[PDB]
Design a protein around this nucleic acid. Structure first.
Ligand SMILES: [Mg+2]
Lengths: 487, 747, 733
RNA sequence: GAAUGCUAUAAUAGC
RNA sequence: UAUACCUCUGCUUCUGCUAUU
RNA sequence: AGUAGUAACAAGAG
């Protein structure tokens, strides 16, 4: 029967197979290079590389979040006092007056001598938190009679082009700082040599991350998303001023409370996990938004004074954005610490692999180098068209950053891209392994990847980085073309 | 400057070796919003889009628009085809039976002998099930109860016998009933005397009224499937629809799967039911043999494979054929018993969910249009996409707001049996005695075909053949997602093989969080997840030690239980700080009591309460482990009227001691606003009956009690003996015994 | 007098006509359905719901009782509990702060027997506490995925048997039909009942705590030389893919586990000693420094009375009384006369399938024993001859017969296999056919007895036969008789054979089992180069690592002296994982290819490295002088344990683009240790012995020649060779 | 010189 | 009408199957 | 507004 049916079936039905060649692997998502599309705009919840925390050295033992936010401004009074709105940038559908009034309401409320961080539901605060903007439910009986009532055309994510600021984030979040943020608690005493190896191995891994920008950002993101969830449930029917706080320790070993700005949390009667709560963010920054204007169309910026960044008097701006979050995102925010594990593991795999080859603990060897082995170096990035080698510690941090960006820009666009591109990564690894891969419908494979590339900054930059690397590998392959070819 | 590219790791490390970095599982999984009717309708359209060239007719039972692709015209193109040829499905199974002699009857025997032992309560372990009495999803255990109570009213007491078979007999009999009656509670006001001005208080009471439905209306509800959207669907841009089935059809599906499982377990290429290390072992062994068996000079090629529209294309009538062909030697009753489940699925009806919401932006009004009233408004009032969907739905639509769906399996109903039909394709191995030989692995739609041939041009002739073979079983290979390479590396069910299945730590990262059971449990689970990851998912000791720290943070923030010596302000922290000062043995305090974390790699597998017990204060442990503490809820040891809605105490894998931190959360009281209130009384009734039964028979908590006699009869006799032996022994007095026998006399 | 109150409450409950009808209609079976009846939908996102709910004022529900009312409503301006009653508990709701309050100023309850209740867990800790930690070692570990026991049991029983025991301990009245099991564990029942007697913990907890230490938690895990539960519980700290930790637990270790491990050690020693000159030299060297857990192998072999050929060989090698005592699970034999020759054959079984079993030749006599019962057995190739036995226990007699019948491998025994018998595991692993047949017939014995056949009982002095029911009968089983009635100084050859004082041998290294298995306890070799007793992949990786380490010298020494650096102690170990029947042939090939690279200038450092280890085993050439030719070199173990000659393989492959050599997934840089010319220098020259490249594929010569077609050429003849896909080469002799 | 087959409220995988 | 600047609610606004058990 | 993204929330109920 099978023979009979296969015999009489149309030859048009086939896998239509073709052997994969490097030249067939065209660049993914060519639209990201089209300059006619808009630059993908910064759409994160909080600021990252553009952030500016006001340093406030503590006794060491904690206090209430209002009390620290007050005492932090009390030190930087020149900013806290600045009551004249020097507007620089305005978000299309924002209200300068309302936003500034709100900022001042926050600063005043947090600066005052009262216990509460509650905000009166002013005409501005209402507009800012989106008071009563929900539509009214009516009977289907009445709905059916109304001709003007229609099913709305689904809003789609618009197409954007590549944006330097994404590259610039990675670069700066990757780099080292003097400041340790992580709040890693105590562990039981070591006994088993495995534990002594683990503990000593941590001192290299944990520190390398703890002393990098990405870490502080992550910790801020967590510690905010905590207090935001704590308020959202506790103070449901209250507008509340939540300060964007974070504890940091310098090389000298001194605790500094870091105020990055103030947020206001609208009413939070969150039934569904997806149900939204409007959070309006006021964030300190040294970044002049006029420099890269296509980055900040979502933001409203006020120049609010200056500070000595070192010997330089840098001007201080205030980035104001009406933002939103839900139960899920807030929860996953409190579980952003696990970015450590995903990055740490992947490299501990390399250390443990290399350790089996050499026959001793290659931890200290891989980072710094020992008497026998010179330090482990990785192809890290590019510099005017040419590949650059970097540290084990760098290659670690570059992953930790990536894993943070996986959270920060984590949506269905990324999920779909990550999963579909992984399929093409493996087809490349085949060509690299010289395992002569074949494909059936490559275009179909591509379309699945390319339909995911819309308005996600990380997805658009990943398509750039992928297309960049592919070109480098495609060059590397040439070496193998003429091997065992006689000639 | 210097521009970092993270993809430049893949220059130093091969993709497979660092695959973990391609899984963004620190990120948020995609959740659905509002209605799933759009996604549901899509399935209903697509299922028929792949069967449209088949035999279309009207069901003289339901009145529904039935479509049948089986034995239909073979495809002209590579668009998904449901037109499977019975002969080819049978031939494939005959080869499978020849390769595995006696397996079919061997399975059928065990599957049949199981069914004879299987009780009804078996159906009370299946999450949310469609209840036909209320036409809403309900807990499996309740959905059954509502069916048993309703069956009794139609003179169907087969349930009471206790075996599944006689209950199943009642289900296929209930289809013959001219009308089906069922209870549906109505509220009733009643004056009650109270210490009140007016001197009374009105309170609404539930009253079980008997509703009836016609033979057809009931049949459609029996054949009905409720539909949702799949939430937290990882690594996918756009959402997909999922279906929950009726307590009627759930019964018959258990046996047809249980059958296919027995077959799969004893197949070389089955990925189901084996899992984790058992699966890795089996696949690692399978790859090794099929690798070394490659002819010298020839080429071994592995097709990393996925099948498209697996559910939409796989037809029930083909699954019917499979049960018939598999049960060939089984007795006539069991051949029929199996036949039912596929028969129900070949006449099944898809419920279209919530509906569509229509709005006016100017007026700021929104309204949900229910599925029955979908064609109540002109289609111009629906958006472009939905208009087409509804137009294509039109000829499969039922006025009660449902869709006829004869073709298609529906989402994941016959996984085991589909795996078999898959394997059956891999069982062919060659067509026309050509210079190739294929053999693979199959876990539902997911398959990895190995082809040993003379040259890769020949391998492709084999793949091209396999492709065409699958098309005759209604199995469509995804040309977009499937890819092929020389044997050595492949992907199967997100397991990445590169001369051995590689570690992929990222996949199970989400499990590292605070599980959300309670304090005492979440610690155990927390450490057990690390311990188990150190073994299976290749987590090194440093990362493992960090994974403790990170947990212990999340725990302390989640359960607001920071170190007693910390200065973190909080409501619980105020008493935690007093406990820290009051306590001498502070290392004996649990983390949840602001105690210090003493966990490390070596002791992950010991309960915290057992680790610290030795260095606790006697008063502290005396509290922490109080035998009759109010947080856990024990027995009376006194007998007033202690009767709460206490669910059956389960047997969870995590090892943790029962103490004050083993508490339970308050029940979501959203129910108090809606008219569903009534059910709380129905619960708090059953609760009373059970809780007391457990006071008579203490073994009921531990082991399932057996008996087709009355609960009252059981309780009566036990208490009657208890009283007699309590009197004759001297535990009870004459005055008490007289009362005992007098009260029991009244029953 | 709890009885009265229950009857009083029943009368209260029966006044509710809705409750009455539930009790009247709902059957005892249906209790299990209405118990699970609830409003609550199953919480799909509990991690979140918890994180959220902990920010609410009263997230927990107390049980309505006098104790709940010992918690105050507020404490120092903290609302501890509300008046509002939970839907579920029908008791007051409270804040997490309530727990913290109770744990601080709550009433101090009696925790009597707690440690006796949770003994299981306290032992778990006691083991970790009274343990000793050795050294961590960095190097390849071949982890194998095997179904192991996760937790030490007090006594192992099937869940059914286990459940019935717990019932007798906790709920005597509601036990049901008294089973045999009841008597079998009467000691355990009484012991536990006496130990849990004066406790206040809830019976349901006590029930699961016993279930935890009676019912077996047996699951697949990646293990390496450690299977004993008390090791498996610590498996996370024992090893990873690339490191190993020596760990000695506490409490006690079984003589049975001590035994089965002690075998693996000896087998592993012998399997490696065989390859060296003077095996007895090495066998003694290793065995004196072999430690099983914390106990030296010599002390272990002295202490234990049992163990296979290997144990006796090593016993002799160390100078200890060799015990010719065998075991077949429950059966225990001691050889009087005979010599067994285990040959693999295709056996047909009763159900009608073909199983591969090792069948023993020769007439042999043993002292068979099973519990109190004792006997003498005589058997030949797949036929039981005669079986004398004593009349001890009715079941111990019944078992010995079934065991002896199976042990004999009688063709009648294989005929009586009617039903489902699994030789292959769910994960396609092998289960010992003889040990599965033993396990099958111990349950279903009536089939074997009927399928065997009966005859007349003996009419001798003390000899009287027994039938199926095990009673003094007229008809007895064909060659079964019951009676009333119940060493020599050896020396061992350097080549490992046990010779008698006469000259006849009793054992040899050729008589030990070829099956490597996971040791129960941790085996340690206290000699440097312990890796030599490793697995195929471990030995393979450790060898090539040692080659790469000493490549500088080893490659130079080769260009001077020819055969000087072929004999190396690493390449000896490496030989013991090569099939002995191809070892010689492979060396013949490899050396020819290596010398061909040296003499004709056409070097290839990756190939040198790959082949050099194979050049140890004394060469074995063809009869016409020329060496044997190969495409791949198969090694001991799984079908993926092979080295390709032309391509790469799961053990060994070289990436020239990166100059990266991959050895069992571990990557090593050949940067620096590589000549300039090699890149362009073809592989075709170092692929066949006495064969060198001339040009590219010449269509006139036709298709690519096989190993055979290549071997069957005459010097100066051209041929088409394929190295790997898309690299055709034209090679000449 | 082998086994002992199961059966969670988490997470993963596929549908 | 109203009580109502009151009261109740925060997964119950339909969350499936099969495996890892 | 905003979140967000093929459909919702921007409180719901007596
Ligand atoms: Mg698929």
């Amino acid at each position: 029967a099978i023979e009979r049916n296969l015999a009489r079936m149309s030859p048009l039905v086939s896998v239509t197979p073709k052997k994969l060649t490097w030249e067939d692997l065209r660049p993914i998502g060519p639209h990201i290079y089209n300059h006619e599309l808009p630059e993908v705009p910064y759409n994160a919840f909080l600021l990252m590389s553009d952030e500016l925390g006001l340093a406030n050295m503590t006794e060491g033992k904690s206090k209430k979040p209002k009390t620290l936010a007050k005492e932090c401004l009390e030190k930087y009074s020149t900013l806290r006092d600045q009551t004249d709105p020097i507007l620089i940038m305005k978000s299309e559908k924002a209200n300068e007056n309302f936003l500034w009034k709100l900022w001042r309401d926050c600063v005043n409320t947090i600066s005052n001598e009262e216990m509460s961080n509650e905000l009166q539901k002013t005409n501005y605060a209402k507009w800012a938190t989106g008071d009563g903007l929900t539509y009214q439910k009516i009977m289907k009986e009445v709905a059916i009679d109304d001709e003007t009532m229609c099913q709305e055309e689904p809003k789609i994510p618009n197409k954007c082009r590549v944006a330097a600021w994404v590259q610039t984030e990675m670069n700066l979040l990757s780099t080292l700082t003097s400041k340790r943020a992580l709040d890693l608690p105590e562990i039981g005493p070591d006994v088993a040599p495995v534990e002594h190896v683990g503990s000593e191995r941590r001192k290299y891994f944990v520190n390398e991350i703890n002393y990098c920008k990405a870490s502080t950002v992550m910790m801020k993101y967590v510690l905010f998303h905590t207090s935001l969830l704590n308020e959202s449930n506790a103070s449901m029917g209250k507008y509340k001023v939540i300060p964007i706080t974070n504890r940091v320790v310098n090389e000298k070993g001194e605790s500094f409370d870091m105020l990055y700005g103030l947020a206001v949390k609208g009413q939070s009667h969150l039934r569904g996990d997806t149900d939204v709560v409007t959070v309006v963010t006021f964030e300190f920054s040294s970044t002049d938004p006029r420099v890269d204007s296509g980055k900040w169309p979502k933001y409203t910026v006020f120049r609010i004074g200056s500070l000595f960044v070192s010997g330089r008097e840098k001007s201080v701006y205030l980035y104001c954005r009406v933002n939103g979050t839900n139960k899920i995102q807030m929860k996953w925010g409190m579980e952003a610490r696990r970015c450590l594990l995903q990055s740490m593991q992947q490299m501990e795999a390399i250390v443990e692999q290399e350790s089996s080859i050499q026959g001793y603990d290659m931890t200290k060897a891989c980072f710094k180098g020992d008497r026998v082995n010179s330090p482990k170096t990785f192809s890290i990035g590019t510099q005017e068209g040419k590949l650059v080698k970097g540290s084990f510690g760098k290659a670690l941090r570059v992953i930790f950053t990536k894993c943070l960006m996986h959270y920060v820009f984590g949506n269905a666009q990324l999920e779909g891209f990550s999963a579909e591109s992984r399929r093409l990564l493996l087809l490349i690894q085949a060509l690299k392994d010289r395992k002569g891969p074949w494909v059936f419908d490559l275009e179909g494979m591509y379309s699945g990847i390319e339909e995911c590339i819309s308005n996600n900054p990380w997805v658009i930059q990943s398509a750039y980085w992928f297309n960049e690397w592919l070109g480098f590998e495609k060059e590397g392959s040439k070496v193998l073309e003429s091997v065992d070819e006689i000639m | 400057g210097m521009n970092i590219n993270p993809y430049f790791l893949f220059i130093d490390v091969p993709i497979q070796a660092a695959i973990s970095t391609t899984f963004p599982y620190t990120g948020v999984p995609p959740y659905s919003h509002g209605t799933g009717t759009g996604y549901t309708i899509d399935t209903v359209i697509r299922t028929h889009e792949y069967s449209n060239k088949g035999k279309q007719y009207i069901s003289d039972v339901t009145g529904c628009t039935m479509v049948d692709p089986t034995n239909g015209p073979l495809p002209e193109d590579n668009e998904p085809s449901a037109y499977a040829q019975l002969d080819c499905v049978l031939e494939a199974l005959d080869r499978m039976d020849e390769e595995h002699p006696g397996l079919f009857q061997a399975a059928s025997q065990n599957a049949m002998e199981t069914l004879m032992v299987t009780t009804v309560d078996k159906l009370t372990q299946g999450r949310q099930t469609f209840d036909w009495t209320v036409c809403r999803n309900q807990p499996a255990a309740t959905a059954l109860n509502t069916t048993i109570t309703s069956f009794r009213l139609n003179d169907l007491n087969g349930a009471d016998k206790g075996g599944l078979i006689p209950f199943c007999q009642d289900i296929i009999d209930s289809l013959d009933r001219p009308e089906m009656t069922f209870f549906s509670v109505k509220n009733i006001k009643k004056k009650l005397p109270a210490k009140n001005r007016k001197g009374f208080l009105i309170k609404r009471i539930p009253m079980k009224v008997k509703d009836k439905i016609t033979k057809v209306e009931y049949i459609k509800r029996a054949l009905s499937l409720n539909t949702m959207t799949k939430d937290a669907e990882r690594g996918k841009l756009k959402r997909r629809a999922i279906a929950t089935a009726g307590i009627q059809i759930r019964g018959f599906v258990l046996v047809v799967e249980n059958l296919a499982k027995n077959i799969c377990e004893n197949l070389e290429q089955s990925g189901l039911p084996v899992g984790g290390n058992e699966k890795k072992a089996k696949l690692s062994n399978a790859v090794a043999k099929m690798l070394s068996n490659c002819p010298p000079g020839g080429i071994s090629m592995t097709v990393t494979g996925d099948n498209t529209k697996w559910n939409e294309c796989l037809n029930p009538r083909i699954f019917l054929a499979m049960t018939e062909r598999i049960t060939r030697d089984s007795p006539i009753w069991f051949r029929d018993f199996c036949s039912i489940a596929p028969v129900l699925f070949s006449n099944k009806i898809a419920r279209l969910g919530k509906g569509f919401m229509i709005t006016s932006k100017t007026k700021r009004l929104k309204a949900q249009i229910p599925c029955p009233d979908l064609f109540s408004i002109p289609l111009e009032r629906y958006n472009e996409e939905t208009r087409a969907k509804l137009k294509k739905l039109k000829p499969f639509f039922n006025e009660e707001g449902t869709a006829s769906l004869s073709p298609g399996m529906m989402m994941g109903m016959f996984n085991m049996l589909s795996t078999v039909l898959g394997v059956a394709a891999l069982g062919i191995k060659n067509i026309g005695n050509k210079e190739y030989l294929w053999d693979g692995l199959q876990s539902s739609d997911d398959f990895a075909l190995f082809v040993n041939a003379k040259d890769e041009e020949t391998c492709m002739e084999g793949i091209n053949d396999f492709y065409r073979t699958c098309k005759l079983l209604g199995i469509n290979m995804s040309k977009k997602k499937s890819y092929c390479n020389e044997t050595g590396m492949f992907e199967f069910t997100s397991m990445f093989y590169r001369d051995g299945f590689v570690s992929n730590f990222a996949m199970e990262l989400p499990s590292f969080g605070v599980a959300g059971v309670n304090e005492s449990a979440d610690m155990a689970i927390g450490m057990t997840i690390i311990k188990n990851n150190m073994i299976n998912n290749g987590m090194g000791p440093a990362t493992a030690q960090t994974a403790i720290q990170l947990f212990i943070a999340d725990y302390r923030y989640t359960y607001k239980c920071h170190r007693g010596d910390s200065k973190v302000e909080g409501k619980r922290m105020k008493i935690i700080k007093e406990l820290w000062e009051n306590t001498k043995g502070r290392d004996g305090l649990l983390v949840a009591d602001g105690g210090p974390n003493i966990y490390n790699l070596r002791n992950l597998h010991i309960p915290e309460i057992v680790l610290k017990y030795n260095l606790m204060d006697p008063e502290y442990k005396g509290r922490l482990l109080h035998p009759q503490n109010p947080f856990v809820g024990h027995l009376s040891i006194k007998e007033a009227d202690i009767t709460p809605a206490h669910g059956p105490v389960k047997k969870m894998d995590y090892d943790a001691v029962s103490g004050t931190h083993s508490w339970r959360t308050k029940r979501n009281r959203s129910i108090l606003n809606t008219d569903q209130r009534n059910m709380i009384l129905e619960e708090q009734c059953y609760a009373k009956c059970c809780n007391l039964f457990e006071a008579c028979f203490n073994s009921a908590s531990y082991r399932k009690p057996v008996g087709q006699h009355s609960m009252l009869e059981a309780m009566a006799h036990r208490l009657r003996m208890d009283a007699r032996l309590d009197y004759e022994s001297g535990r009870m007095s004459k005055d008490d015994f007289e009362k005992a026998m007098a009260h029991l006399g009244e029953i | 007098g709890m009885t009265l109150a229950k009857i009083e409450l029943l009368k209260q409950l029966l006044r509710d006509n809705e409750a009455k009808t539930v009790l009247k209609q709902t059957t005892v079976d249906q209790y299990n359905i209405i118990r699970k009846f609830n409003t609550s939908r199953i919480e799909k996102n509990p991690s979140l719901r918890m994180k959220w709910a902990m920010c609410s004022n009263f997230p927990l529900a107390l049980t309505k009782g006098d104790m709940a009312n010992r918690i105050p409503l507020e404490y120092k301006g903290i609302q501890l509990k509300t008046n509002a009653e939970d839907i579920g508990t029908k008791g007051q709701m409270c804040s997490i702060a309530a727990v913290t309050w109770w744990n601080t100023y709550g009433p101090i309850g009696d925790t009597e027997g707690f440690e006796r209740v949770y003994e299981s867990f306290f032992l778990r800790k006691m083991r970790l506490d009274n343990a000793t930690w050795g050294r961590i070692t960095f190097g390849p570990v071949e982890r194998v995925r095997k179904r192991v026991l996760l937790n030490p049991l007090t006594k192992e029983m099937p869940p059914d048997e286990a459940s019935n025991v717990i019932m007798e301990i906790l709920f005597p009245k509601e036990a049901g039909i008294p089973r045999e099991s009841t008597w079998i564990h009467r000691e355990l029942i009484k012991e536990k009942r006496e130990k849990l007697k004066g406790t206040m913990i809830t019976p349901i907890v006590l029930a699961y705590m016993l279930e935890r230490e009676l019912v077996a938690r047996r699951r697949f895990l990646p293990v390496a030389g450690a299977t004993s539960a008390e090791f498996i519980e610590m498996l996370h700290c024992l090893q990873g893919e690339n490191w190993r930790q020596i760990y000695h637990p506490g409490g006690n270790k079984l003589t049975e586990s001590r035994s089965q491990s002690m075998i693996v050690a000896c087998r592993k020693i012998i399997r490696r000693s065989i390859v060296a000159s003077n095996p007895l030299e090495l066998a003694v060297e290793i065995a004196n420094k072999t430690v099983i857990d914390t106990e030296p192998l010599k002390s272990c072999l002295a202490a234990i009375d049992g163990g296979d050929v290997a144990c006796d060989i090593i016993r002799a090698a160390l100078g200890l009384k060799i015990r010719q005592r065998q075991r077949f699970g429950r059966l225990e034999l001691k050889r009087i006369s005979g010599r067994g020759f285990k040959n693999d054959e295709e056996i047909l079984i009763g159900n009608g399938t073909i199983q591969k079993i090792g069948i023993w030749d020769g007439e042999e006599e043993f002292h068979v024993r099973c519990g109190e019962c004792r006997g003498i057995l005589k058997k030949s190739k797949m036929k039981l001859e005669k079986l004398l036995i004593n009349s001890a226990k009715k079941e111990d007699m019944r078992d010995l017969i079934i065991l002896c019948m199976v042990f004999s491998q009688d063709t009648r025994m294989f005929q009586g296999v009617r039903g489902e018998i699994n030789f292959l595991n769910r994960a396609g692993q092998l289960l010992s056919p003889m040990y599965q047949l033993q396990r099958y017939f111990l349950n279903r014995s009536n089939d074997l007895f009927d399928q065997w056949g009966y005859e007349e009982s003996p009419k001798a002095s003390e000899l009287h036969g027994i039938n199926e029911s095990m009673n003094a009968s007229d008809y007895t089983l064909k060659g079964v008789v019951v009676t009333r009635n119940v060493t020599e100084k050896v020396s061992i050859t350097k080549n490992l054979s046990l010779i008698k004082r006469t000259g006849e041998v009793i054992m040899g290294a050729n008589d030990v089992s070829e099956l490597e298995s996971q040791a129960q306890l941790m085996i340690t070799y206290d000699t440097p180069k312990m890796w030599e007793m490793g697995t195929t992949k471990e030995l393979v990786q450790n060898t090539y690592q040692w080659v790469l380490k000493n490549l500088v010298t080893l490659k130079a020494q080769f260009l001077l002296g020819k055969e000087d650096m072929f004999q190396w102690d690493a390449f000896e170990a490496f030989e013991s994982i090569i099939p002995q029947k191809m070892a010689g042939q492979y060396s013949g090939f490899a050396r020819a290819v290596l010398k061909q690279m040296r003499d004709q200038e056409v070097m290839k450092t990756d190939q040198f490295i790959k082949l050099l280890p194979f050049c140890f085993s004394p060469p074995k050439l063809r009869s016409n002088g020329e060496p044997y030719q190969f495409l791949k070199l198969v090694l001991k173990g799984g079908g993926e344990n092979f080295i390709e000659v032309r391509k790469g393989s799961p053990l060994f492959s070289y990436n020239p683009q990166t100059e990266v050599l991959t050895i069992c997934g571990r990557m090593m840089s050949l940067k620096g240790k590589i000549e300039d010319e090699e890149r362009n220098r073809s592989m075709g020259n170092a692929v066949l012995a006495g064969f060198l490249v001339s040009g590219k594929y010449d269509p006139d010569l036709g298709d690519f020649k096989t190993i055979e077609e290549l071997e069957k050429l005459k010097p100066g003849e051209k041929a088409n060779i394929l190295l790997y896909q898309g690299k055709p080469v034209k090679v000449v002799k």
